[model samples]
Target: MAALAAAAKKVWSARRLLVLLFTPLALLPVVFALPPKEGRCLFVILLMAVYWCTEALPLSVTALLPIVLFPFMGILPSNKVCPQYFLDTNFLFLSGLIMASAIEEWNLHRRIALKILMLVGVQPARLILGMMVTTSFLSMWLSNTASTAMMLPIANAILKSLFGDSRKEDEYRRNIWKGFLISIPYSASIGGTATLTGTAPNLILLGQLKSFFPQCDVVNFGSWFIFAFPLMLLFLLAGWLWISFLYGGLNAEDRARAVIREEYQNLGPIKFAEQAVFILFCMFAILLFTRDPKFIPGWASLFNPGFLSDAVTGVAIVTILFFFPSQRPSLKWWFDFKAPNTETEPLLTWKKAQETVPWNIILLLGGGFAMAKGCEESGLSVWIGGQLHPLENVPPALAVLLITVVIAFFTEFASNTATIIIFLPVLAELAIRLRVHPLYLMIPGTVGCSFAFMLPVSTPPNSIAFASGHLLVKDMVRTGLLMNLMGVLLLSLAMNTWAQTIFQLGTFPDWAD
Candidate 1:
């Protein structure tokens, strides 16, 4: 029985390989029915989607397939597909990662996270809020995975102190622990929606917007923040309230406060590195926001505005960051004592940057752009949109709601990045055909992709939270299911109200033409 079960487990593990080899043959029929041009592109899309959805290959490696399949299948030339992997947005993503790496490397993120935890105190409700608030805030500027990873240990340590080695803790304490863990990943995912650089799907939204409509300049860092930041806060509030209600009524709050304070104290004093990274991070945000505010003249006014982009600001900041020495040189007193100056190292080193950045995400991003471009060139996007003509008579707001609903659940079982890459093109075309602002459909769709909270496998942050062994799959699903529904409903409300004003969604923009 043991040997037979082991063989069965082996077969289950080999499923990825079997799916990879046989799925292409299985897809031949779906490929043959479409027009040859569009059909070939569909073949690649379907194959890539399967690979992306399954762990058959690394996600970035799957993205690379288009580079090979596009030209060979005659959907696009090699020149076009290869270049799609590196666009203006790609560099923006690349530079953002490098700067983020510098913050992480110097332990600056930890200092801020701990400081916030200490400031929030140790009341049960407040502690949960602090975890979400800190995780979400860091997530606004850093990757969700990193932010969640950084917060989990600190959060777990606090839990350990509170529970004190009792596996069979009281029911109230157990609920608090579960709720705390859930909040970290959920907030990380939602907070990422606040900025263009906050999440991959946000960038994918920007890249696809440009690819489909080059003249569209309405979506940028300042504009996106203006739109998304409020929604992020609203979502955060809803999540906090729900998590508190689900796990409310607790004790041992005072004891945990000192534990958190001690953790913060361990860092001793704020150093030059933390201050420097914080200042640089602030400058980077300000530069990106002010570069083009749309309503007023910006720094871009100094040059031909077309010549400037957020990418230029990102790359420039990253370059300057590399030149600043991490340690301040000792000096004779203008006001104080001094010591001999020693050799200094730059704020960001190449080796550390390499170690910290997730290079595969760059490829995943490129592959998304390439896929979008191929869909455009081969008429697949148009073809797909044409199929949605039946929905032309449906209320546009209703259609938007439906799109969010489908995307939110689909993302639970697949990667949010892959989910948006496939859905955005269709949504873009759907918006165009409906004669509504493309953003009306696209923006919500982009956000819905991030609402995958129902399962550990849904997103990286959730996976990290689950791996802690404190929560079960059912625990995540029970809490996450409500969050998902709330996200879709909240987004629907935002789309019809503030979103219309922010993007001028009342009328279809001429640029989308």
Candidate 2:
């Protein structure tokens, strides 16, 4: 019987069929269940969210559901709904990815990581600190998955060499290993909090803002960095300290420096390609910072009637990278077909761009936009907001804290992007009904989406570390639950304190009405 069941399971795919059929069909009751427009829109939302969660279809495929469903259901036109995928927010995301691709293309990211590890040295406590700091900084720019993957080999090199051909049950070894393991994923997540393009949730917040309100365009890359960077640094530090405390102080050791130095040496010398990409990386950051340099009204303000948007700035910089030459030791510019050697090539090619950029994320962005539009047009947002009106009695600070708590916890269960996309519209309406600034609620909720840390299934980084066979479920939870709660407190503090002034959160401004 066991063999028969196993054979049946291996040969059949019923789960996929169930998810595919049940999702849209389950919502059929809703067609007769509510007003035409609202019911249809609700069906679409429930359908997309269910498909996204179950992955009954590809996420990108799920995203495209609106493009087809909306027009057929009379919720929106094919023409009207299709444009949301390629909006400014999408471009900004694409351009940011282009830079992330360039950083990987030249191996500059590895060099930087090695350099950080080199500087921090290899003492047990210090080694964990170095790993956290390096991983955090890399994750600030690179995808958390990439950053975590990159650091794993380096961490593994140290870990294997120390435990060497044998597994040790020593107290300090456990401490050292557990802390180092948690650092990369935790730092990766914390680092994403620093930039607007650092993660999908930030983009979702800004995108939804532009969708529902006109005033939210003020959140440029630079301003977002100002608001979140300090907090990111603090969290990285706090995470590092907590991990260190749990596993503990290191004894005397000279073996650490040798490991770091060897890894650094193994990376070889920095090449011309790296130098080129580094300069461009700096330039990319400068463009984002200078776009709306409101501190004394820098270059962006110089335009009398026209200033380039951040999307334009990012796209322009990313385009230039394609022409910036990389070293071609194999082929040189020909003098009428002269022998070729030691030439330079462009930093990136369209093919590489296609391979490197997260095209699925672009689709996801579009889908979120399409859904937000449906919610707006179908009166779904207003109705949802009205439903939340009972919360009007809650204090704004308490409201922000509650938002932080709810979002922070669930990010561990679902994709942060989906979580944000699903909630941003409702939250926006809630803020409107509550008579508070949408940003006050939006900002906290978005940050909370990146705060997942409890489960092995929480994030790719967490999964990667857990697969190493060194950590247990209890080990992650012991640290994650505390961090999860602390993250809420910290976010609530920032939203209500220093961040309030930097973001101008005191009262409703003219942009939001």
Candidate 3:
């Protein structure tokens, strides 16, 4: 053989890459005698899907391909594809990120986490709950990756403090650290599902729906909170109980409280920085909930031209911080004690804000949007939906359960947003074919994307927790598999019950078809 012609072949297999690239086109439209153009679009989806799973490229870099391929292939116009990347939904995520960046910059997030942990008392179950709550709440608005990064250190510190006198880590100690460390990531994931801007997947759902099915009712921040917060609360409580039951030490509960108390004392009084972020966060929340609220006169009706969108509100509030000043100076009995002068810094900066922004994620969001548009423009979504038209004979709840479980398992090693970008269009079309409401499947499926708990590769939060060294893959897999089962069960129930009522999922909505 020539030196370069036939070198070494690789060993065993890899990510479903070759299969992903070639298999779909062969077994899919080509097998179905679908149009060549549509097959090419499927190729784009499969290629991007493969790149997303294998990390042959960064996820963001993979996302950018649509901007290039769609235009060249004539599946979508360059202007249309590019615009999808920068919609109001994009700003919605961006604004929340800016807010999170400011919070991280001032160390306000730490103060808040410590405060909650102190209040909850550090009993085995109580400490787990406290940490879970803190992590979940932070993840609700901040990126799960950021949430995990922040909580891991605090959690490790607590672990060290509580068991500092112990030896080179016993099984009991390892078990305890597993529960503590693991809670942060799971809680981050659970918490993220509670808000529209919480995770890339949540925003992805909104973006896809708008791009593909804009005739539907609005899915504002408030509505998402109403529907998802309950599930989050339930999941956290159940997860905390499950983890504690496995590794929690009741006998050590008394000792842990003193550690928390001491740590709280070390944190000292809350600074003005913390106060500002907290108050602003509260106000930001109030604004989100009150805007075009379902049960009340929405704040939007109060304006002549109506207030700007939630994204605008978010950006405006975060923008004000730069001029808001981190401190108002000291309050004193004398005029000398107060300095309203230029001694203070703004809340955050371009440098810090840039550092905090998850730029890759933003691009990923854009790419998903572009892909959703391609599905609409290319007729691939329709073909996929038609293939699943047999599901028309299947019951609605069964379909929900099926799609939900599959995506949950699939996200373990793949990018949830990318997986979802491909999924939402296909499922939306499936719902159309089955003549059921799109959300009936789409809602549960969207939530399922966040339920990845099985492996470290599943999500950034899981990876962060695993790297703590206190946890083994065996421990995570052992717990995570069970939790996955529990999540699938609970998610299925909620979709058919409480969530069904919230989203009116009992039958097909008029807007879907």
TM-score of each: 0.95, 0.92, 0.90
Q: Each candidate's lDDT (Cα)?
A: 0.89, 0.82, 0.81
The residue ranges of model 1 lying beyond 4 angstroms of the native Cα positions read 1-10, 165-169, 330-342
lDDT of 2 by residue, 10-56 (tens): 65667766878877777899878778998899899988888876667
Error of 1 at 294 (Å): 2.4
Clashing pairs in 1: none
lDDT tens per residue, model 3, 64-177: 999888888788889889999887888989888988888887777777787788788776688888999999998987888888998898777777767764564577787888
Candidate 3 has a TM-score of 0.90
Candidates ranked by lDDT: 1, 2, 3
Q: Which 10 successive residues of model 2 have the least lDDT summed? A: 327-336
lDDT of 1 by residue, 1-513 (tens): 799999999989899999899889988986789999899898899999999998799999998999999999999999989998888898888888988898888888888998898888777788899999999999988999999999999988898888773654577778888999999999999999999899999999988877888888888888898888989999999999999998855256666777777877887788787788889999999999999877667899999858989999999998877878787645443346354345578898888888888889999999999999999899998898888878888789888999999999999999999999989988998888888899999999999999989998899999999999988899899888899889998999988988887788898788876
Global CA lDDT computed for model 2: 0.82
lDDT for 252 in candidate 2 is 29
- What would you estimate as the lDDT of candidate 3? 0.81
Model 2 ranges off by over 4 Å: 1-13, 165-169, 249-252, 304-307, 328-343
Give per-residue lDDT, candidate 3, residue 81: 90
Segments in model 3 whose C-alpha atoms lie over 4 Å from true places: 1-33, 165-169, 249-255, 303-307, 329-344
